[PDB]
Structures are given as structure tokens and as C-alpha cells.
Amino acid sequence: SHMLRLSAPGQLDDDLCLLGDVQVPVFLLRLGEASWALVEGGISRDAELVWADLCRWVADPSQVHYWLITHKHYDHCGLLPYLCPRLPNVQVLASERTCQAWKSESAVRVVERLNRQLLRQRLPEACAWDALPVRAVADGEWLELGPRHRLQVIEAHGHSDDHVVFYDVRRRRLFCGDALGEFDEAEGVWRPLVFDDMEAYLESLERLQRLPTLLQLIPGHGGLLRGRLAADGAESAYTECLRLCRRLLWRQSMGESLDELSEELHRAWGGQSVDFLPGELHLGSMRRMLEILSRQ
Ligand SMILES: CC(C)(C)CNC(=O)Nc1ccc(NC(=O)c2cccc3cn[nH]c23)cc1
Ligand SMILES: [Fe+3]
Ligand SMILES: [Fe+3]
Known part of the structure; x- marks a missing residue:
């Protein structure tokens, strides 16, 4: 219900x-007119929900040409095996290390296990992780998605060792x-994560x-942020991380174990x-x- 946070399904902007x-x-x-892309790859159990929504906007799903992926965590790529079979022309665009995770039997195993814990239902027929129609993309690479969509890949490690963001400079829009x-x-x-x-x-x-001032900031969860939340997003996130370090140091300096702030943070x-x-x-x-x- 905050005007600076769009958190409803459906249309968010003209595009x-x-x-x-x-x-x-x-x-x-x-x-x-006949070309679309997806950004972020969700959790597996949402395959039919997302598919249903997609088909309400896109009359012919073979027009979905690209699928952009920020990182390999189970909640950001769980849909790929279940929906790519229904998207014959899609190319998944992910970083090198993200693609490597889908070639690792053990990494894929964790991803499937975490996603199955979210099943209420059974999943669509999935293609193999190593058979996904992927194309690795590099730090700084320009993604010419269409005549009015040019997004730069920007390496953004720390949350995870493979993580990247995508920046639409025409729109001052950061995924x-x-x-x-x-x-x-x-x-x-x-x-902080x-x-x-x-x-x-x-x-x-x-x-x-240091990017040009953002107008739209679109994280992995929660919808679209705009106004000052977008303009100040990266700075505020930095500040809140330092705030968590200081808090951690304060409590450890009182002899607290990491389990205590962990339980308070979880609560x-x-x-x-x-x-x-x-x-x-x-x-x-x-x-x-x-x-x-605590280490760093
Ligand atoms: C990477 C592999 C080896 C391939 C295994 N794969 C995984 O996916 N491990 C994994 C990923 C993410 C999370 N998440 C969070 O704890 C969390 C907590 C709060 C907000 C948010 C928002 N997003 N995530 C979170 C936990 C475990
Ligand atoms: Fe994550
Ligand atoms: Fe996440």
C-alpha cells in the first residue's frame, strides 16, 4: 500500500x-510486437501459476526469446527445467558460474531438494538441468534484447559467488x-543477505x-521500488549492512554467541x-x- 513499492501481479510499466x-x-x-523476455527464475512449484500468468499476456509463447537469471540459488532458477520445455525459442542468459552450477550434479541436487520442500501437487515434466538452452554472459556484456531494450550485465558478487545484476540504462532500471x-x-x-x-x-x-541515478529498482523478491527507494537503494543497502556488522560486534563484545543474534534475526x-x-x-x-x- 506504499506508493513507492509496486507489489501486485500484472502490469507494472508500459513494457x-x-x-x-x-x-x-x-x-x-x-x-x-512478437518478442518477450523473462527476468528471474523463481521456485519450481510456481511453474503452473507463472505459466498461467504468462499465457494471459503472451498469446504465442514461442515469442519468449530470452530468460535472464541473476544467480543460482534455488529460489531464482527453480522454474527453468519446468517451463523452458514450453518455451521452444527461449535462451537462458546467466553468468559463467551460474551456468556451471547447472552442470554440477551436486549443486542441482540441492536446488531440487529445496524446491521440492515447497510443493503443496506434482511438477510438469522437466528437461535436464544440463540440457537447458543456456548462453553464458560476461561481466560488462551488453544484452541487445530488442530495439528498445539494451541491458548491461554487471557482476555483483557477495550475496553469492555467481551473482549478477542487469541494468536497463534507457529506463534507469536495475534488476x-x-x-x-x-x-x-x-x-x-x-x-542484508x-x-x-x-x-x-x-x-x-x-x-x-555509481550507476546513473535509478528510477526503478527490482530485487529478487517483493516487487518494484521507485522514487527515492530506487535512487538511494544501493547506498541504503550498504548502510544497513554496516549497521548489521556494528550490531554483531556490539553483542559479541558482550560475550554473546552467534546463535543469539541468529535467533533474534530469524524471529x-x-x-x-x-x-x-x-x-x-x-x-x-x-x-x-x-x-x-564475524570473520570479515
Ligand atoms: C547454491 C547451491 C549449492 C546450488 C544450493 N542452492 C541454494 O539455493 N541454497 C540456498 C539459497 C538461498 C537461500 N535463501 C535464504 O536463506 C534467504 C533468507 C531471507 C531472504 C531471502 C531471499 N532470498 N533468499 C533468502 C537459502 C539456501
Ligand atoms: Fe539468493
Ligand atoms: Fe532469493
Whole structure:
């Protein structure tokens, strides 16, 4: 209900729709009269929901030509095996390390296990992960998606070691995945998601702050941010991460164990993701983040 946060399914801009669940959304870009792209790859159990929404906008799904992926986490690529078979002309665009994850039997195994925990139903017939129609893309690569859509790949490691963002400079629009963290709907601030490397996470935010002023900021969860939330997004995310480090140091300096802020963080932050993230995994991830901050 905040005017700066668009969090409803359907049309978001002249060229853009939100498909599926706002908390794990798939974004639809209209590239031309007969060309479309998807951005973010969701959770597996949403295959039929997202497919249903897609077909309400796109009369012929063979016109879906690209599918852009920020990182390899199970909640950002779980749909790929289940929907790519229904998209004969789609090319999945992911970073090198993200593509490597789909060639790893053990990595794919974790992804499938996490996604099956979210099943209420049984999944569509899936192609193999290693058989996905992928094309690796590089840091700085320009994605000429259509006559009015040129997006630059920008490496944004720290949340995960493969993470990238996509920047539409015509629209000052950044698809930032989880590199800024989890947007707090009740409080209007970023919650950090430092799950791989704090130093890389903070350096990505420094670089993203140097982009031309954002008009639209589109993370991996929660919808589209605009106004000052977009303009100040990368900076605020940086600030909130330092705020979490200071908090961690304060408590450790009082002899607290990492388990204590972990439980408080899980209590205070675990509610937002309970529909796509098992509660033990949220607590575990909070523990892992504090471990990462504590070292670095
Ligand atoms: C990468 C592989 C080896 C291939 C295994 N694959 C995975 O996907 N592991 C995995 C990924 C993400 C999460 N997430 C979170 O804990 C979390 C917590 C709060 C908000 C948000 C918003 N997004 N995520 C979160 C947990 C485990
Ligand atoms: Fe993630
Ligand atoms: Fe995520």
C-alpha cells in the first residue's frame, strides 16, 4: 500500500509485468510486437501459476526469446527445467558460474531438494538441468534484447559467488536480484543477505551506487521500488549492512554467541520468506551470514 513499492501481479510499466507471486516473482518484458523476455527464475512449484500468468499476456509463447537469471540459488532458477520445455525459442542468459552450477550434479541436487520442500501437487515434466538452452554472459556484456531494450550485465558478487545484476540504462532500471538484500516491507529498509562474502557484497554495492541515478529498482523478491527507494537503494543497502556488522560486534563484545543474534534475526526477519523458504533454512542462513560478517 506504499506508493513507492509496486507489489501486485500484472502490469507494472508500459513494457513490464509481474508474473506469479510477488514474493518470488518472474518479470515479463515486452521487447516488440512478437518478442518477450523473462527476468528471474523463481521456485519450481510456481511453474503452473507463472505459466498461467504468462499465457494471459503472451498469446504465442514461442515469442519468449530470452530468460535472464541473476544467480543460482534455488529460489531464482527453480522454474527453468519446468517451463523452458514450453518455451521452444527461449535462451537462458546467466553468468559463467551460474551456468556451471547447472552442470554440477551436486549443486542441482540441492536446488531440487529445496524446491521440492515447497510443493503443496506434482511438477510438469522437466528437461535436464544440463540440457537447458543456456548462453553464458560476461561481466560488462551488453544484452541487445530488442530495439528498445539494451541491458548491461554487471557482476555483483557477495550475496553469492555467481551473482549478477542487469541494468536497463534507457529506463534507469536495475534488476538487482538479492545483491541489496531483502527489502523490509513493514519498515522500508534493506535487510542484508550476505551469504557468501561480505567484502565482495559491499564492493558490489559501491559500484552499483555509481550507476546513473535509478528510477526503478527490482530485487529478487517483493516487487518494484521507485522514487527515492530506487535512487538511494544501493547506498541504503550498504548502510544497513554496516549497521548489521556494528550490531554483531556490539553483542559479541558482550560475550554473546552467534546463535543469539541468529535467533533474534530469524524471529524478527523470518516471517517475510516463510512461503518460499523453510524456517530452518532461514535461521541457518542468518547463522551463516553472521559467521561471514564475524570473520570479515
Ligand atoms: C547454491 C547451491 C549449492 C546450488 C544450493 N542452492 C541454494 O539455493 N541454497 C540456498 C539459497 C538461498 C537461500 N535463501 C535464504 O536463506 C534467504 C533468507 C531471507 C531472504 C531471502 C531471499 N532470498 N533468499 C533468502 C537459502 C539456501
Ligand atoms: Fe539468493
Ligand atoms: Fe532469493
